[PDB]
From Swiss-Prot:
Function comment: Regulator subunit of pancreatic ATP-sensitive potassium channel (KATP), playing a major role in the regulation of insulin release. In pancreatic cells, it forms KATP channels with KCNJ11; KCNJ11 forms the channel pore while ABCC8 is required for activation and regulation.
Listed name of the protein: ATP-binding cassette sub-family C member 8
Binding, ATP: 11, 15-16
Record-stated family: Belongs to the ABC transporter superfamily. ABCC family. Conjugate transporter (TC 3.A.1.208) subfamily.
Location of the protein in the cell: Cell membrane
Location of the ABC transporter domain: 1-195
Binding site for Mg(2+): 15, 45
Superkingdom in the source lineage: Eukaryota
Primary gene name: ABCC8
Subunit structure: Forms an heterooctamer with KCNJ11; four ABCC8/SUR1 molecules interact with one KCNJ11 homotetramer.
Portion of the parent chain present: 706 to 925 of 1582
Length: 195
């Protein structure tokens, strides 16, 4: 249930840190238990599309629910996209289909993650490819997504400082290492968060 930001310079390893969070690197040593080693949704740094309908890009091996779909459509800012799609959800997307923008692909990925209702969400800079108004949408609906999240843990990697006061706690990373984790006052003493 914590709201935790991950920040640092372009190329400092933030996306690689997310890959570490996905278990996609080689652990040289140490112990890691996330309750999943007892005997998940993903928004990748570069969005990718499956070759299917927008609808099936949303379902992601699930049954179809259309109230959940209505709430997801409103919550994921997908009404302008539907409004500009030639057949709405029946538009063929992915390879050899309609060419979605990077922002539309990101919004589809966000909708995929919200629809999957996972316990852990990894967002790799999710509002970079969206406009300021859509970023405000992702702010309010994000806050009512984590709020919609019934106690779930949400990890929001971002390169932007715009909403670091508006998440709960920040962990600052640099050069592939964690530099500091802590309160606003702690990071004021770091003399970083103000900068």
């Amino acid at each position: 249930g914590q709201l935790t930001m991950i920040v640092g310079q372009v190329g400092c390893g933030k996306s690689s840190l997310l890959l570490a969070t996905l278990g996609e690197m080689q652990k040289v040593s140490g112990a890691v238990f996330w309750n999943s080693n007892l005997p998940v949704a993903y928004a990748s740094q570069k969005p990718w599309l499956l070759n299917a309908t927008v609808e099936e890009n949303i379902t992601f091996e699930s049954p179809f629910n259309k109230q959940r779909y209505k709430m997801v459509i409103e919550a994921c800012s997908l009404q302008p996209d539907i409004d500009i799609l030639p057949h709405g959800d029946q538009t063929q997307i992915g390879e050899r289909g309609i060419n979605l923008s990077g922002g539309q692909r990101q919004r589809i990925s966000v909708a995929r993650a919200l629809y999957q209702q996972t316990n852990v969400v990894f967002l790799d800079d999710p509002f970079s490819a969206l406009d300021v108004h859509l970023s405000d949408h992702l702010m309010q609906a994000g806050i009512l997504e984590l709020l919609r999240d019934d106690k779930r843990t949400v990890v929001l990697v971002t390169h932007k400082l715009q909403y670091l006061p508006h998440a709960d706690w920040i962990i600052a990373m640099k050069d592939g290492t964690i530099q500091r984790e802590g309160t606003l006052k702690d990071f004021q003493r770091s003399e970083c968060q103000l900068f």
